[PDB]
Amino acid sequence: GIVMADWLKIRGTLKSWTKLWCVLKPGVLLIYKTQKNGQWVGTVLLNACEIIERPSKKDGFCFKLFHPLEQSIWAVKGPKGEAVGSITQPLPSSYLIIRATSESDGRCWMDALELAL
């Protein structure tokens, strides 16, 4: 039931950006290390999120996914029941900052995200 799938650049508290494979389908953003034989990193539950644009210095196009009550946006278990996620740079409990490599790509993602919410 995939709606969009692409590499996206993701950051947390740290200034560092990590390029990860994200699959958008109804209700969830699924994050993997690779498109192919991906190790599951985490799943964002869109039901718990709001989305806002986040204009910035390293931009491409930049937006923010967050829990309005600053609670967890993350699914407890993997799409295949995976107990624990693959190691990445530490990501925030209650938000993701996201930029697509191209601004036009970023805009489609953001617009797409609003629907899947």
Numbering used by the authors: 8 to 124
What does the paper say about this structure?
The oxysterol-binding protein (OSBP) and its related proteins (ORP, for OSBP-related protein) have emerged as central regulators of sterol/lipid transport at the junctions formed by ER with other organelles. ORP5 and ORP8 possess the structural features of a lipid transporter: an ER anchor (TMD), a membrane targeting pleckstrin homology (PH) domain and a lipid-binding module (ORD, for OSBP-related domain). Indeed, ORP5 and ORP8, and their yeast counterparts Osh6p and Osh7p, have recently been reported to mediate the counter transport of PtdIns(4)P/phosphatidylserine (PtdSer) between the ER and plasma membrane (PM): ORP5/8 was shown to transfer PtdSer from the ER to PM, coupled with backward transport of PtdIns(4)P from PM to the ER, resulting in its hydrolysis by the phosphatase Sac114–16. Critical to the transport function of ORP5 and ORP8 is their recruitment to the ER–PM MCSs.
To understand the structural principles of ER–PM tethering by ORP5/8, the structure of the ORP8 PH domain was determined by X-ray crystallography. A distinctive feature that stands out, however, is the presence of an unusually long 25 amino acid stretch forming an extended β6–β7 loop (His209–Ser236). Comparative analysis of electrostatic surface of ORP8 PH domain with Osh3p PH domain reveals a distinct positively charged cavity, representing a putative PtdInsP-binding region. The analogous surface on the Osh3p PH domain has a neutral charge suggesting that ORP5 and ORP8 PH domains may possess a distinct PtdInsP-binding mechanism. Close inspection of the distinct positively charged cavity of ORP8 PH domain shows the amino acids forming the basic patch are lined on the β1–β2 and β5–β6 loops (non-canonical mode). Structure-based sequence alignments of related PH domain containing LTPs ORP5, ORP8, OSBP, Cert, and Osh3p establish that the putative PtdInsP residues (red inverted triangles) in ORP5 and ORP8 PH domain are not conserved in OSBP, Cert, and Osh3p. Notably the side chains (green triangles) mediating canonical PtdIns(4)P interaction with OSBP, Cert, and Osh3p are missing in ORP5 and ORP8. To confirm the importance of the non-canonical basic surface for PtdInsP binding, we designed point mutations R136Q, R179Q, and R158Q, R201Q in the ORP5 and ORP8 PH domains, respectively. Both the point mutations in ORP5 and ORP8 PH domains completely abolished the binding to PtdInsPs, confirming that ORP5 and ORP8 PH domain follows a non-canonical PtdInsP-binding regime. While most PH domains (including Osh3, OSBP) utilize the canonical PtdInsP-binding regime for PM targeting, the PH domain of ORP5/8 possesses an atypical PtdInsP-binding site that does not permit PtdIns(4)P binding.
